[PDB]
Structure formats: C-alpha cells, structure tokens
Amino acid sequence: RQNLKSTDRAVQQMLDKAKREGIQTVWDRYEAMKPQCGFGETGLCCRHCLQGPCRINPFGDEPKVGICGATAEVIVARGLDRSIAAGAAGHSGHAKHLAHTLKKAVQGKAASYMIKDRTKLHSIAKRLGIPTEGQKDEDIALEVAKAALADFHEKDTPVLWVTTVLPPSRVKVLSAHGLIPAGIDHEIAEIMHRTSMGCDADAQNLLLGGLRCSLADLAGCYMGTDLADILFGTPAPVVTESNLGVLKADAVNVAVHGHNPVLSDIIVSVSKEMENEARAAGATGINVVGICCTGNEVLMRHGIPACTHSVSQEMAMITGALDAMILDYQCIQPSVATIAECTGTTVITTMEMSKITGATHVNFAEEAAVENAKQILRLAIDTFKRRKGKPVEIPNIKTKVVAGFSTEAIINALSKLNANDPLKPLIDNVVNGNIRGVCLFAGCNNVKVPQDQNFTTIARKLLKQNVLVVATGCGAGALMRHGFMDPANVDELCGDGLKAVLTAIGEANGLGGPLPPVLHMGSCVDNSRAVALVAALANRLGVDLDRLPVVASAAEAMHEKAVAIGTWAVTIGLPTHIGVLPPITGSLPVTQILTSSVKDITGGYFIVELDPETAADKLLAAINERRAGLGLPW
Amino acid sequence: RQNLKSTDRAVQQMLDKAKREGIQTVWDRYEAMKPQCGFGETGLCCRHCLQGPCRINPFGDEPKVGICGATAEVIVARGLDRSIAAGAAGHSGHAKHLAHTLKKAVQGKAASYMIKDRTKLHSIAKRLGIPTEGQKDEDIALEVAKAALADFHEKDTPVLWVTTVLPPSRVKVLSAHGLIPAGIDHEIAEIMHRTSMGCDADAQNLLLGGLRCSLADLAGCYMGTDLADILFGTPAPVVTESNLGVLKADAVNVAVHGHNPVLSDIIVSVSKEMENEARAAGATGINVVGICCTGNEVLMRHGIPACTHSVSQEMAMITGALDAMILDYQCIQPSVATIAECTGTTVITTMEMSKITGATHVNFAEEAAVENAKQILRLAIDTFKRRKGKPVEIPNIKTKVVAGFSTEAIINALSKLNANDPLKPLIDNVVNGNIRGVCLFAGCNNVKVPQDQNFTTIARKLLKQNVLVVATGCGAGALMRHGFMDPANVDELCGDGLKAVLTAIGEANGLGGPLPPVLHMGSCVDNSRAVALVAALANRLGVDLDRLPVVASAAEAMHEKAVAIGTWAVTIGLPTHIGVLPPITGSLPVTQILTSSVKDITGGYFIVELDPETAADKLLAAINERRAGLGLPW
Numbered sequence A, B: 001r002q003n004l005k006s007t008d009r010a011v012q013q014m015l016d017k018a019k020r021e022g023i024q025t026v027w028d029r030y031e032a033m034k035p036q037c038g039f040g041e042t043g044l045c046c047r048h049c050l051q052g053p054c055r056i057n058p059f060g061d062e063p064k065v066g067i068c069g070a071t072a073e074v075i076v077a078r079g080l081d082r083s084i085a086a087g088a089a090g091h092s093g094h095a096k097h098l099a100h101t102l103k104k105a106v107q108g109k110a111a112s113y114m115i116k117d118r119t120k121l122h123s124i125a126k127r128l129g130i131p132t133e134g135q136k137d138e139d140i141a142l143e144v145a146k147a148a149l150a151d152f153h154e155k156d157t158p159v160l161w162v163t164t165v166l167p168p169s170r171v172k173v174l175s176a177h178g179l180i181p182a183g184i185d186h187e188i189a190e191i192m193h194r195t196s197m198g199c200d201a202d203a204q205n206l207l208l209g210g211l212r213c214s215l216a217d218l219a220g221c222y223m224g225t226d227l228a229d230i231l232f233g234t235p236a237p238v239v240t241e242s243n244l245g246v247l248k249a250d251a252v253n254v255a256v257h258g259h260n261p262v263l264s265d266i267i268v269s270v271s272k273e274m275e276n277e278a279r280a281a282g283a284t285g286i287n288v289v290g291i292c293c294t295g296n297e298v299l300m301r302h303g304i305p306a307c308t309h310s311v312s313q314e315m316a317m318i319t320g321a322l323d324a325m326i327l328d329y330q331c332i333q334p335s336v337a338t339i340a341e342c343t344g345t346t347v348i349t350t351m352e353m354s355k356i357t358g359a360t361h362v363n364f365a366e367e368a369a370v371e372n373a374k375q376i377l378r379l380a381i382d383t384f385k386r387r388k389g390k391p392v393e394i395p396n397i398k399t400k401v402v403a404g405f406s407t408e409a410i411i412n413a414l415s416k417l418n419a420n421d422p423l424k425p426l427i428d429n430v431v432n433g434n435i436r437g438v439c440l441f442a443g444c445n446n447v448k449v450p451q452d453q454n455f456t457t458i459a460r461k462l463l464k465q466n467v468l469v470v471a472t473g474c475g476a477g478a479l480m481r482h483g484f485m486d487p488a489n490v491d492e493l494c495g496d497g498l499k500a501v502l503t504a505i506g507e508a509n510g511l512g513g514p515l516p517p518v519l520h521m522g523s524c525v526d527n528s529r530a531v532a533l534v535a536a537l538a539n540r541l542g543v544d545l546d547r548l549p550v551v552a553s554a555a556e557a558m559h560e561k562a563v564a565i566g567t568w569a570v571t572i573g574l575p576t577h578i579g580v581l582p583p584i585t586g587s588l589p590v591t592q593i594l595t596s597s598v599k600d601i602t603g604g605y606f607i608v609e610l611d612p613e614t615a616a617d618k619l620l621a622a623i624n625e626r627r628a629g630l631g632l633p634w
C-alpha cells in the first residue's frame, strides 16, 4: 500500500522497486522504530547531565520531576530551545560560508565567484547604512561581507540582519521584550548555556530566550538569501520541471543535494563546460538535477529541474540512473551512503564538517571551485560509463514548474499593474476580497505524514477560498510535484477571486495567461524573502505584521531548522501552523505559552494541528480574524 | 542507610532531618527515576529531528538504525559533541561576563570593579603580544578585554586563549589534526550545525570536531581564570574551614552559589560593610559561606568557608539556618526554589538568563553592583529576623582547609627551594621517585555514586603511592570535606616520599610543617591553572604534555562542563579517568576512539572505570607508563 507512504506516484513506483530489490528505505526504518518512545514524543526526557537520563510520566505516578528538580515545564522548554539553537546554527554555518565566499571573491582569492547582482549589492549596502557613492563595488562588497560576519558576535549594534529588515514598530515591540539578538553565534551559545544543568529553570524565561534565538535564525536566513543573490543573481520567473522523470537514462545524471549555492551554482556552470567530455563517454551531456534546498537554489536562478525532496530523496537513487549525488550539508539522509553501493550511485561529500562514512570525499574550496567541480564531475562521468547496458527504471512522471518569484520579482510583476505603487494592486485585492489573505507553506516532509498530503490538502482548501499561496523549501517541492506551480491548473485549483488576480497580473506581464496557483519564493533561507514582502506590505500600510492577514504553515515539519523558522514566524507576528507534533505536549504550561499567551508578546502564535482539513479551517479562521481586525469583510 | 547516599557525615545528618520532615531530596528524586532508560544510558537515543525520537537496541533485533539512517556510531558521537558544546557554552558565558566586566571597569562604567592584580594584567598582555611599555594600565586592560571578546568569533588569528597557553609543540600537533578552534562561539555553533539532522555522519570526523570544541572550552576556562585574577586578585595560600558546621545559628548565613566571582566577590566585600546593620537586626554579623564554584572562588581569594558542594547542596537549607542563597548560574539544582518554602531560606536569582520559578529575582548589574548587593543582603537580614526563636540543626562538623594554590603560588612555594629555577625541585623529586607523578581531581559529585566515595578512595591510593594530588571544583570540595586539605593529615595519608617533599616545601615556606596532602587549585575554570603548571613543566623539560607523568580524574562527573573539561584534558595529552559512564557504550567504535585510538592523535585518552580501586590502579599504571617512557624507575 505505497499510497500510505507517499502521495507522489513516482515515489510509489520507486518504493515498489526498492521493496523487490530488498533495499531498506526511510519508511522501512520508521516502521522498525515503532512504537516510538512516548517520553521523547511528549518532550518529557532530559539528558542534559550524567545523572540522567531523566523522564517524567505524562500522567500517573513517579517519576514526576527530574533528578535535579527540573519540572516538566523546564525540561520541555530546554529541549525546545536547544532545537531552535541547532536550527539557527545550521543557518549560521550557511550564511557565514557565503559571507566568507563573497569576501574571498572581492579580495581576488576566489575568481570563480563575482558580484553578479550589483543592484542587490547596493540596495543591501543602503539598507545597512554602508555608503556607496564614490565607492568601488568591490569595497562596498567587502564592507557588506564584514557587516555580515560582525552580526555573528556582540558589538556596539544589535544584529542588523534583524533590526534593518523589520519595520521600526516591530523592532520596538521586540526590543521592549528583550528579544533582539545581540549576535547570531552569541545567542546560540547563550541558549546552550542557559539550558545546561542548573541554569535557567523558568519556562517563560526559557521561551523568551528561544524567541530571541529564533530571530538569530531569521538573521542567518536573510543573510543567506542576500549574499546568495549578490553572488549568483536575484531570481526572476523561470520555467522548468519536477519529479523523477527529469532524470534521463542517456545522460550523466548528477543531483545537487544539501544547501549552499556556493557549491551547486558552480556545479551547474562547470557541467555545461564538460558537455563534450560527457559525450566522449557516450552520454548526451550532464543532466544536473536538484534535491532539497540547493536544488531549489539552482531551480530558482537557472531553471535546473528538481528531482525530488526531503523524505523521498533515496528514491532518486533507486531508479538506477543517478550517477552522482553531490552533497554539502543538512537534510541528507546518511542512508544514501549505503544505498549507493546497491544502486551504483557515487555519493560525494565536499565539506569538512559534513562527511558520511562510505561516501567519497572531495574537498571543495572556493579558491579552487572550478577544478574541484571538474574532479567531482569526472567521478560522475566514470560512474555513467559503468552502467552502460544496465536497465534503469525512471518513472515517466514530471510536472511543469513556473518559479523564480523572489520578492523583487513579485514587486516587478505587480508593477505592471501599478508602476509607482506596486504593492497597491495586491492590497486593493485583499480589500475587495479577491485575495482573502496570504499563506506561506514552508519546511520539510516528515515520514510520519504520508508524503505531501498535508501540504496539498491544506493548499487546496486555501486556494479555493482565494488565499494567495506562496511556498519555499520542500513545501514548494511538495506543491510543485503535484502541479501547483503549473498555470494550466489555475482553473481547477483557484477560487474565482484569486484566479482573477493571478490572471490580471499574468496578462499584464504579457503571459496570455495567469501566474501559477502557488508562487515559489525559493529555498528555506528564502523564507526571508516572504519576510521582506510582508514587511514591505506592513510598511506600506503603516501597521505592524501582527495586523496583516498573513499566516504560515510548516505542514510536515522535520528539521530543527523548521522549528527555528516556525518560531521566528511567531516572533515576527504570524499565526503559524505546524502539522506534526513538536515535543511540547508533555507540558500544558509550555503549550499554552506557545499557542496562546505568546500572542500578548509578539502577536503571533503556533497552531498545532495534525489533521490537515482541520488545520486549513484554523488557518482560514486566523486569516479572517486578521481581516476583521482591519475592518474588512470576510 | 544514609551512608549509601553520602560519605559526608554532615550530609547524612541532614538527610535524616529531610526524611523526618518529608522534604524530598536529589537522592529521593533519583530513586523515583529508577530504572533509568537504557537507550539514554548507552547513548542510543536521538531527538535531533521531529521524525524522532529514534533509538537503537544495544543488542538484539530492530531498531538497529535511526530513521534517517544514522548509525549507532553517529548517534553516540553527535550526542557527545552536543554535550561538549554545551559545556563550552557555559564557560563562554562565564568568561564573556568577566570580559565585559573588566571593560566596563576600565571605561569608568563600573566603579565597584578595578584592576586588583596589575602583575597578572601585564603578564597576560605579554603572553598575548599586547604592548605594555609606555601604556596606561586601563588601556592595557581595555586591550586584554578586547582580545578576550575577539576570541569568541573568527578573525585573522585562531583562539589565542588556546595557542598562547600551550607550548608550540602541542599547538603544532593539534594544528596538524585541524583541532585549533577558530573562535569559541563559532565552534559551539559549528557543533550544533554538524550534529543537526542530515549533516556530519562519520564518527571520527564528528569526534575530531568535538576535540576542537573542547579546546574552545579550555580557552573559556583559561580566560575566566585570567580575568577573575586581574579583577579580584590571584590566589595565594589561605586557611579556612569546610562543611555545614561553618554555618552559625547566631549570624545571618548567606550562601553564594553558582559560578561567577563578578557576583560573589562583591557579596563578600559588601557583607562586611553591613555588619552593623546585621547587628541591629540581632545577628552577630553576616556569615558568607560558599557552595560550588563561586564558593571556591571566594574561598581561594578570601578564605570564605565552604558550606557544601554539588549533589548535597540542598542540605545546607535543611539546617534551617540558611537565610539566603544568592545564585548566578550553573549547577544549581532548581529544587532549591521549592525547598526554600519549607526551610525559610530566601533564594535569589540575579542573572537574566538564569531564573528559577518561585525564587525572588534581583537583577545584578556590574554598573550598580554595591547597591544591588545591599538590596540582596537586606532580604537576607529580613529572613534572619523571621527565624528568631526557631531551633536550627547545624551539624557540628567541619574540617580545616588550606587552599589558595594558584600556579603562581605553587611556583612561589617551590622557589623557596630554588629561587631561579622553581620548577626544578619538583622535577628533581619526580626523577628520584619521591613524587611518582601528578593527578588532578576535577569535576562534580553525581547522585549515582555515594557522594565523595570515588574521590577519596582514589586519592588515598594515589597519595600512598607518592602521587602529588591537585584538585579543583567539587573534587576539591570532596577532598576538603574529608580532611585532605589539612596538613595535620599528611602523616596518615601520604607516602614517605611525598611526605618528605611536602615537608621540605612547607618548611622552606616557614610553616614548621608540610603543605597539605592535596593542593587546591581553585574552581572548575581554574582547571586552567593546572594546564598552566603542566605546560610550564613541559616547556622546562623540552617535551610535550603527552610525555609527562600527569593524569586527570573526573571521578564523579555530572555536568556537560565536566564532559568538556575531560575531553580537553585528553586533547592536550593527558590520560583522563571518568568515574561515571558517559553515554558512549552503545557504540564500540566510539568507545574505542575515545579510550584507545585518540592516543594516536593527541597522546591522551579516556579511562572509563566505575570501580574506584580499579580506577586508581589504572591511573597509577598510566603514570608509571609515562615514567617508563622518560626512562625513569617506577
């Protein structure tokens, strides 16, 4: 019954192949884990010192308290805070990598990289207060890179990738509650300190710390998007395809997987240089395809087709046609290294801090990026030769995907309706009800949830109710693989008001047709683009973000990064749905803070709801409450 | 049977009182936790994403692997690395607090603080390369504080509080393995990143990262000692007392508990100013007593008597005579806040990131330290008045404690035997066998181990075999409470060779008697002082630390900080005993790295041994192996 595992037909087909070949998958490893520990599920477990492990029974008799005296409240809040810090750290590593790449590029130390988007460079400099008039671009960029690195530590200003990206009224609310981060890595360390044994032991205090660390995560996301746009170009609308059918038996199929475009962008360019070398090996060329966020990055900037996402990543290998999987860090199931020996795929790690036993490691240095890419791609070509004559099973399943909707691109599209007030047509249509509100789908797939089922079920209900839907990360991946990024599906999916707006925008952009049903805003760091759009709307309207009819949904969340993103969505003022249970239910006081009393602090709040049709109703209620608060019909 | 819980008679007496009063203790909460989870005990549990909790059976059938494919090796190494990062973070917060205090002091923003040890200031400046000739002390100190803060982040130098405190040959070995930290908070964040889902998944790679983060912990320890010595004075030999009998029914009894002398040092000075105000309230005065590291800090610098330590901290309250417990952060059982309502004690938190529900919070700002201290101490005086006429039960049990053996003080003591080559008399007596080697006892008490039993059992065996024993933290606390810091016990405890050396040193220092059986080197950050001594010996001999007959023992370890300290002891080259099981036994490959193959990387290694007489034999074998490698009899 493969539809219980994934709603993606291509994934189902590969699940059948894996089963008859005896190749264990993530779903099999989940089945082998059941029943999962109920202490961990509820958050009522602590291993923060060597007197543990400690646990607390959700109900009944002892144990009721940790050995040191830590209550359920404390234990739950500490575990949650550590997850937020871990998510922030992954974003810290990604953004910091980009900042070092930009610095090296403009210092002449990494000639494969350059300032591709000078307009974005200057507009970031202006946002930060860095002077541009009379300055060389390379010096402006050096100052931007230095400012990015400075936000990792304490200094005489707070984290500018928070305070310069949200409207002053939001910054004021956050400052009044002590929530503005002092430095990105500073906050990560402070979380790890305060949550260590015998430190912070007040749930509200712990959770305020977590909100602040989530803003350090936001800063890392925003910095990552900013720097990748400078280096690799700001996305604009592009047309491509998704799902396993984008693999080609007669090509060298190379997946880029992980997160940082410092790696994947060069793989894309260098692969085009090597087309004749691939052809000498009997291939048609090198077919680069994307998995997870780094796939999203190259999809957004270059139209590289997306192979698959998140929980189903192993299935690309099961086709037998995946010659190489080129990795950097984050969200890579380490099972890929063992599956590769069964499928023939060459799995290649590239980052010193992210190795997998059994995978080939090829260090990738920005200073030698082109040469390191050629070494990697020659391993892929060799692998293609080894499967000469071997049958492959690529499901002939793909969707059309229109993407590339950076905030700059959205504003440009709207400007065709109103050149000097581009946000006004969007606002006008919220007011007249053609657009009920906005929902951002974000985050991962999670083996506990049939793959994509929550994203598609919720998105369908919202689209029929005229909600403008935007998406990032593997939420965008779920939606694209089910046709939600194909404008041919607007009539089927969209309410009449939303269809009218998507059509009016599309026709004014010369498309002869509408924008797609869902706007793909990019990778998970590119949730920052949604922040830029929402902050721009708030500024245009003269209200704070917690008055806008905008919600978020991490409908199938998995990674610590998704916990961090959901927490900063709450902190900036949004009603934020999570469609899997975070480890909080073991403390009613913590649950009540996160789902209710945080409204009084930031105006946002979590909506924890595992049933997707119920979650859609709750999301619509949250949007409609925001509409009523603005005096609008709903 | 209270001797099964603690070997300290005073603690036993208070356990009996707590039992008849119905006051739950840490031992009761431990009993209620049994049997503890065997997945957590072995390290075979992961909660690093929302697909978890995952576990692996140590033996038998499925589950054998985490849902994402993470092996036992990976899961164990990731959990260990996060513990190291958490320990480093606690040390980051402590050192950073001191650096900000020093900066404020010399900028005129915190007049309660000053440069007390100008010699230490100048010798730190010289060690770091900061010019002193022709400079004002306040400017030198500003540069030292700036250098301390700079070591938290990446810059054009590595962490100087690693590279300037170990000999070049050690730094070279560590650099060859990529182990020198780039920045303290940078490494903490990198650990949290690499251990997040879908990142590093190679045990050896993960553990190398952990070794590097442990050096970030060492830098925080060393920075903490350096800055506290500048601000509050370098310790020199002092005589005081320990155990609950240091409480006085007729005084206002105030415990300082937690970690940072920025708080406790001012409590000590201000309490003396308030003696007439305490007397107006009917007390004899304010009797400041120490718990845990901040108690050690004021013991070492001012001879403030130590009340108790670590696992037995609640027992101070059970006397009924503890009027106030003044907290900052780390190692404070949060049970103290509920026990206070039973005992009448006023528990006061002071740090924004370390609150306890039910405790009174009085913010403590360096800028207002004296005034904030008076507010705190007036709460203590009010509490004393409330117990007028109430019987108290203070066990009449105390030991004499000689302490204050900073490395500077040890060198000075030795200089009375050899003025211009002070380390030579120590080396001479190692060579002639009067001193077999050196053992550092460090770390906590742990409820799993009858309190102090491992420290005292191991120390007795080593002292009889002529080992020079030094101690810090609650290891020093255990030893002092059992008489190991009283020179009157030298004849009973020490082998003839060690007694001869302690006597020769003591007589040359005018004592008419020996140094104490164990030298108290201070708080847990002051494990850095032992590093300074051992590095000085290595430099004097022209060999690396992994050739010296020096070992460490975290005999009853508890906190993540103790895991970090033990890991850096290994990383700098020492055989390092741990007397409780860290969560590693679920992976034989990880255990083998930590106990054996790390020898080939750093020359140090863990000795995991829960039986203390066996651990003593293993420690002596390690010392004697080092002696043999130097060509010495043993």
Ligand code: SF4
Residues within 6 Å of the ligand: A046, A047, A048, A049, A050, A051, A052, A053, A054, A066, A067, A068, A069, A070, A075, A196, A197, A198
């Ligand atoms: S910190 Fe407290 S609750 Fe956590 S493992 Fe240690 S004793 Fe148990």
Ligand code: SF4
Residues within 6 Å of the ligand: B046, B047, B048, B049, B050, B051, B052, B053, B054, B066, B067, B068, B069, B070, B075, B196, B197, B198
């Ligand atoms: S990171 Fe892997 S092993 Fe850990 S909880 Fe998630 S799926 Fe399980």
Ligand code: F3S
Residues within 6 Å of the ligand: A292, A293, A309, A310, A311, A330, A331, A442, A443, A444, A445, A473, A474, A475, A524, A558, A559, A561, A562
């Ligand atoms: S890249 Fe990773 S953070 Fe979630 S959105 Fe996709 S599994």
Ligand code: F3S
Residues within 6 Å of the ligand: B292, B293, B309, B310, B311, B330, B331, B442, B443, B444, B445, B473, B474, B475, B524, B558, B559, B561, B562
């Ligand atoms: S102060 Fe804490 S780190 Fe251990 S040595 Fe004492 S319980």
Ligand code: FES
Residues within 6 Å of the ligand: A037, A038, A039, A040, A041, A045, A046, A053, A055, B037, B040, B045, B047, B053
């Ligand atoms: S008792 Fe299962 S997660 Fe700890």
Ligand code: FES
Residues within 6 Å of the ligand: A037, A040, A045, A047, A053, B037, B038, B039, B040, B041, B045, B046, B053, B055
């Ligand atoms: S299963 Fe008990 S510590 Fe997780």
Ligand SMILES: [Fe+3]
Residues within 6 Å of the ligand: A259, A292, A293, A331, A473, A523, A524
């Ligand atoms: Fe991602």
Ligand SMILES: [Fe+3]
Residues within 6 Å of the ligand: B259, B292, B293, B331, B473, B523, B524
């Ligand atoms: Fe301590």
Ligand code: NI
Residues within 6 Å of the ligand: A442, A443, A444, A473, A474, A524, A559, A561, A562
């Ligand atoms: Ni994501």
Ligand code: NI
Residues within 6 Å of the ligand: B442, B443, B444, B473, B474, B524, B559, B561, B562
């Ligand atoms: Ni300690």
